[PDB]
Amino acid sequence: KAKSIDQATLQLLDKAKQDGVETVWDRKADMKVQCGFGSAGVCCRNCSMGPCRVSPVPGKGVERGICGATADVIVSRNFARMVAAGTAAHSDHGRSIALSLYHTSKDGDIKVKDENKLKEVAKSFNVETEGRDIYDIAHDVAKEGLSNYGKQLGEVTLPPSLPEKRKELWRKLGVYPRAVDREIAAVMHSTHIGCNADAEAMIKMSMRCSLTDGWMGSFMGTEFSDIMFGTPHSIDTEANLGVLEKNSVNVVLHGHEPLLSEMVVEAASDPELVELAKSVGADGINLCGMCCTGNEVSMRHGIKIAGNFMQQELAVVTGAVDGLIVDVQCIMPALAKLSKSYHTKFITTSPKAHITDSIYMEFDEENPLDSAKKILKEAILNFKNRDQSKVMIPELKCKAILGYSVEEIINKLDKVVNTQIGPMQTVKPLADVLVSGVLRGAAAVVGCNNPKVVQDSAHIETIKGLIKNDVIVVVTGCAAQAAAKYGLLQKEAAEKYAGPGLATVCKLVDIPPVLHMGSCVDISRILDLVGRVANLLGVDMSDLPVAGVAPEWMSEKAVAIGTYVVTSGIDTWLGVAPPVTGGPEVVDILTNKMEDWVGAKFFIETDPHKAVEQIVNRMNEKRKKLGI
Amino acid sequence: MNLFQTVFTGSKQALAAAEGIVKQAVDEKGRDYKVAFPDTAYSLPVIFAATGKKITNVGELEGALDIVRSLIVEEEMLDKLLNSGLATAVAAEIIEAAKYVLSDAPYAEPCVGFISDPIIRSLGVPLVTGDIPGVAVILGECPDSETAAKIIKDYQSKGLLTCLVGKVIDQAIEGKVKMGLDLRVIPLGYDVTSVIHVVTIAIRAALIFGGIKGGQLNDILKYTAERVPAFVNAFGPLSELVVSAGAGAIALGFPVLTDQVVPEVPTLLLTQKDYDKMVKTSLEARNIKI
Ligand code: SF4
């Protein structure tokens, strides 16, 4: 099987073979046939009476663990713990953002750059704004956001875009969210030996936990990031490994937390550091981003995107990365080993993510700019250790357009609003094109890479099929970066891949057929958008012809995302089977009974063409239900 | 019934009416009997633009229903909707041709029916010059004669060439609107199919001024969209046939504005209840400068 559809990826894999270094593909091959029990989710290790493995085939072999737990119980608890872990990752990201908001000041390193956005958020949090200092408002907003994480009395605060009907449905179902850390703790408590042994209740607890990710953690992280670093607008950038410069210092930012990458971008324009880069013999400083931190700095500043998850190692294989600065999440620990074969400084900066044999330079949030300058100076000084004979940068990079926040999308939609009719600054043109049938629907393509799928193949095939069927596509994360590398994030792509209705819409609004809405936490934006559409049409989000796809997901964060997208009322297709096939009841809940609960359900489909067909059929049947 | 289904239903009704009237013409006059429009050089302009074929006898008119049949594909995608609008336009043209071959004088005053080529050439000079900054196709009935007269005279005072289809003709007559080719208020006919008589004005504008040869349908549609500043104001309740004819106008690149609640399409299908702002809304939608 081919390892990737990306030619630059293939060239660097040949180079890695020539250099005698191992990749994620090599380790996947070394793992050989993976354990069937773990793959089906019928293995349990929740107590030291175990490990227990029960048969993935009902009626045969061992039926219960030592405590008496069935295959359905073991599967449901394993799934719930994946959701809890994903929720924890996203919530910790949002908590750091809220703490940064709490420390903003007029003369400090972290300021308020979008005051209108802050005032609207303050309105959503019942924070007074009129005749008040902007930083007093910011601190009050940060306090309310922080209380969302750990309040023990009262109800949490949810964005106004969430329909009232969806909230009432959640309350009736028993999944209405509480404080984020409280829900994570509840899931961890109920999976403990001898607690919850009922699959339906376990799945409902996991949905309840995932809601605190989708609508509170990721949402607050995104909106506070907009407040502090600016709301994204349409902006040009370049993507894929070709963005590395042979004659410049190459600094690659990998990870998820945006404050460090924002401070690194600011430090790169420091005159002393630019002079130092010139003095070490480089033309300048070339900042490139990877994964979600790359998505953030690219959405807000046009920083070039070096690559997505399964390309991180190959970035080092070029031999041109002088510094690789990482914060947390989706940072392959093998990088520490791999950087030994090159001059690259692999720099960890977060106390949450220590990696053995990496260079640890703790990013100081109290003095973010000075700390970022010190880290960047280490990366620049490493340019003297470059071995130019080992350098091979593929001449493969692609132009991309991104920055499509909800605000930017609304601004673009204002173009097709007749001034004599109005209203302006709404999602009404999008609702109109969806209701009329010019657009069949909207689909979110999100998720990681996975060695189980030819890298980027499923993302590209799913996106092309959807836009060919007049389904407008919004992309986040590594899927968005796969689209960027391929060339879908271009206005020209409208006439090259889209169907007639979507091509007309793209021409009228002057947008690409695929809209890059940011990082994984920025999936909250997608929720926001859908909610607005629903609130404009007076229906629940489960009545709309919308869907989400995770063609190549790998992370626990992806599991939590799919869970809260389904719980919000949006059908979700998974291109990689989650470890639930061992529990028939869990499969039936996720793919059949969930529709009775929340009006949406999971679809497991490993063939992208079949997934596109199923998405189109499901959207059409929801349209016929809605009468459009 | 959604927009696509409404357009498909309208196109099927137009096809049924065309089949009935063609059967009547075949029964009364014979398949060798001549089929023509008064003083034109492009036979039936819509069929000539779509295929290049000139319809000369009744048998060929009966064979032209296959064009309407092939232009109706009931799949909910935008291209099929535009093709279905074009099917309605072809069916309306066939109905008008059958009217002309059945009756010696199908239209009486003030209705003018078909517009001859010399009138098109006369209007071409002020069209490109800018003395005619647009073509207002008014179809249906306004709630009052006063509002219809007000809108029509507002268009007239701005130099636009306004064409009238339906009961709006009677409302304008009650409103003391002075009509004629020099007064730029042209009543086409009381039936919806009479709207084709302004559609052929645009089509022949591509045939005469644009120089596009017959059968180059995409070139004709591009020319009408980028050169002919026409728009539709549909007043009063809209049947499926009216919506299908509006889909044809959209296929020609002409935006359709109405006072009725319809599934809106930005820049193409717009609802404007306020009759005091309909003229400005249409001028903005068609990008017309006075
Ligand atoms: S919780 Fe039950 S099934 Fe799991 S390891 Fe312990 S005894 Fe075995």
Domain extents for chain B? 3-102, 117-286
- How many residues are given for chain A? 628
Any long-range contacts for A591-598 (C-beta under 8 Å, 24+ apart)?
A593/A200, A594/A203, A594/A566, A597/A173, A597/A204, A598/A169, A598/A173, A598/A207, A598/A542, A598/A566, A598/A567, A598/A568, A598/A569
Q: What are B234's strand-pairing partners?
A: B139, B258
**Six token digits for residue A548:** 């989400």
Cβ B244 vs Cβ B7: under 8 Å: yes
How many residues are given for chain B?
290
| Residues whose CB is less than 8 angstroms from the CB of residue B222 and which lie 6 or more positions away in sequence, other chains included | B253
Residue in A415, A426, A436 to test binding to B, most B beta-carbons within 10 Å: A436
Task: Report phi then psi at A132, rounded to 5.
Answer: -130, 150
Q: Is A273 helix (H, G, I), strand (E, B) or coil?
A: helix
Cβ of A420 within 8 Å of Cβ of B281? The answer is yes
> Residue A548's closest CA among A476, A450, A451?
A476
Give the closest residue to B234 by CA, choosing from B258, B268, B199, B198: B258
Mutation choice for B interface testing from A418, A427, A507, A623 by most B CBs within 10 A: A418
- Running DSSP on this structure, what letter comes out for residue A51? -
Question: Which residues of A fall within a CB distance of 8 Å from B287?
Answer: none
Among the partner-chain residues B3, B271, B284, the one whose CB lies closest to the CB of A419 is: B284
B103 touches chain A (CB under 8 A): no
CA-closest residue to ligand 1 atom 5: A50
Q: Which residue has the tokens 């100081």?
A: A364
Check A627 against B76: CB less than 8 A apart.
no
State yes or no: B66 annotated in a binding site: no
Q: Which two tokens stand for residue A268?
A: 């790169």
Distances (CA, A) of B182 to B38, B156, B159, B269, B281: 20, 11, 11, 30, 25
The strand pairing partners of A455, in sequence order, are A4
From the list B4, B78, B280, which residue is nearest A420 (CB)? Answer: B280
A333 alpha-carbon distance from chain centroid: 20
Chain center to CA of A25: 22
- What's the A46 CA to ligand 1 centre distance in angstroms? 6
Coil/strand/helix, residue A305: strand
Residues of chain B with C-beta less than 8 angstroms from the C-beta of A431: none
**In B, which residues are within 8 Å of A510 by CB distance?**
none
Paired residues of A348 in beta bridges: A326, A360
Alpha carbon of A602 to ligand 1 centroid (Å): 27
CB contact under 8 A, B269 and A417: no
Query: Quick one: how far is CA B6 from the chain centroid?
Result: 18
Distance, C-alpha B198 to centroid of its chain: 5
- Nearest CA among B82, B77, B2 for reference residue A438: B77
CA angle A484, A489, A490 (to 5 degrees): 130
Residues of A in contact with B265 (CB under 8 A): 432-433, 436, 438
CB A261 within 8 A of CB A296: yes
Torsion angle of C-alpha atoms B169, B171, B174, B178, degrees rounded to 10: -40
Give resolution, Å, one decimal: 3.3
User: Which residues of chain B are within 8 Å of residue A421 when distances are taken between CB atoms?
Assistant: 270-272, 281
Distance CA B33, CA B57 (A): 5
In words, the CATH class of domain B117-286 is alpha beta
Q: Which residues form the pocket of ligand 1, taking CB atoms under 6 Å from any ligand atom?
A: A 44-47, 49-52, 65-67, 69, 74, 193
Burial of residue A250 (number of CB atoms within 10 Å: 0-12, 13-18, 19+): buried
SS3 A176: coil
Residue type at position B249: A
In the Cβ-directed half-sphere of A626, how many Cα atoms lie within 13 Å?
24
- Nearest-CA distance B263 → chain A (Å): 5
First-to-last CA distance in chain A?
43
Residue B218 near chain A (CB below 8 Å): no
Gap between the Cα atoms of A549 and A538, Å rounded: 25
Amino acid at B76: E
If residue A514 lies in a helix (H) or strand (E), which one and from where to where?
strand A514-518
- Find residue A16's DSSP bridge partners: none
Determine the angle formed by the axes of helices A556-567 and A523-537, rounding to 10 degrees. Answer: 10
Q: Which residue, B216, B13, B185, B208, is CA-closest to B95?
A: B13
Instruction: Flag if B265 and A628 touch (Cβ within 8 Å).
Output: no
Nearest-angstrom CA–CA distance, A511 and A515: 8
* Long-range interactions of A424-429: CB distance < 8 A, separation 24+: A426/A532, A426/A536, A427/A529, A427/A532, A427/A533, A427/A536, A428/A536, A429/A509, A429/B266
Beta strands at A52-53 and A43-44: parallel, antiparallel or unpaired? antiparallel
Identify which of A52, A54, A64, A77 to mutate to test ligand 1's pocket (most ligand atoms within 8 A of the CB).
A52
How far is A562 from A574, CA to CA, in rounded Å? 8
Which residues face A235 on adjacent strands? A402
SS3 A53: strand
Q: Are A357 and A250 in contact (CB under 8 A)?
A: no
- Scan for tokens 């209007």, then name that residue: B123
Tokens at B190, concatenated: 């009381």
Using the atom order of ligand 1, give the atom closest to the CA of residue A45.
5
Q: What angle do CA B169, B173, B179 make, to 5 degrees?
A: 80
Residue type, position B89, single letter: A
Helix axes A115-124, A218-229, angle to 10 degrees: 150
The verdict on a CB contact (< 8 Å) between B77 and A432 is no
Would the CATH topology of B3-102 be identical to that of B117-286?
A: no
For residue B110, cis peptide bond before it (omega within 30 degrees of 0): yes
B266·A499 Cβ contact <8 A: no
- Pairing outcome for strands A323-326 and A345-348: parallel
State residue A251 phi and psi, 5-degree precision.
Answer: -120, 115
B3-102 maps to CATH 1.10.8.190: yes
Contact A466, A610 (CB under 8 A): no
- The residue written with tokens 């009237």 in the block is B21
With H, G, I as helix, E, B as strand and everything else as coil, classify residue A230.
coil
What residue in A sits closest to B287 (Cα-Cα)? A418
Does the beta-carbon distance from A470 to B270 stay under 8 Å? no
Report how far residue B157's alpha carbon sits from residue B153's, in angstroms, rounded to the nearest whole number: 6
Secondary structure of chain B as H, E, C letters? CCHHHHHHHHHHHHHHHHHHHHHHHHHHHCCCCECCCCCCCCCCHHHHHHHCCCCCEHHHHHHCHHHHHHCCCCCCCHHHHHHHHHHHHHHHHHHHHHHHHHCCCCCCCCCCCCCCHHHHHHHHHHHHHCCCCCEEEEEECCCCHHHHHHHHHHHHHCCCEEEEECCHHHHHHHCCCCCECCCCEEEEECCHHHHHHHHHHHHHHHHHCCCCCCCCHHHHHHHHHHHCCEEEEEECCCCHHHHHHHHHHHHCCCCEEECCCCCCECCCEEECCCCCCHHHHHHHHCCCCC
What amino acid occupies position A422? Answer: G
CA torsion angle B188 B190 B193 B196 (round to 10): 10
DSSP notation for A583-628:
-HHHHHIIIIIHHHHHS--EEE-S-HHHHHHHHHHHHHHHHHHHT-
Instruction: Tell me how far apart the 2 most distant CA atoms of chain A are, in Å.
Output: 73
Beta bridge partner(s), residue A465: none
Distance between CA atoms of A177 and A325, rounded to whole angstroms? 35
E strand or H helix that includes residue A253:
strand A249-254
Residue A90, Cα to own-chain centre: how many angstroms?
9
Which amino acid type is present at position A389?
Answer: S
State the structure-solving technique. cryo-EM
**Which residue has a Cα nearest atom 6 of ligand 1?**
A47
Sign of CA dihedral A167, A168, A173, A176: positive
**Strand B185-189 relative to strand A602-604: parallel, antiparallel, unpaired?**
unpaired
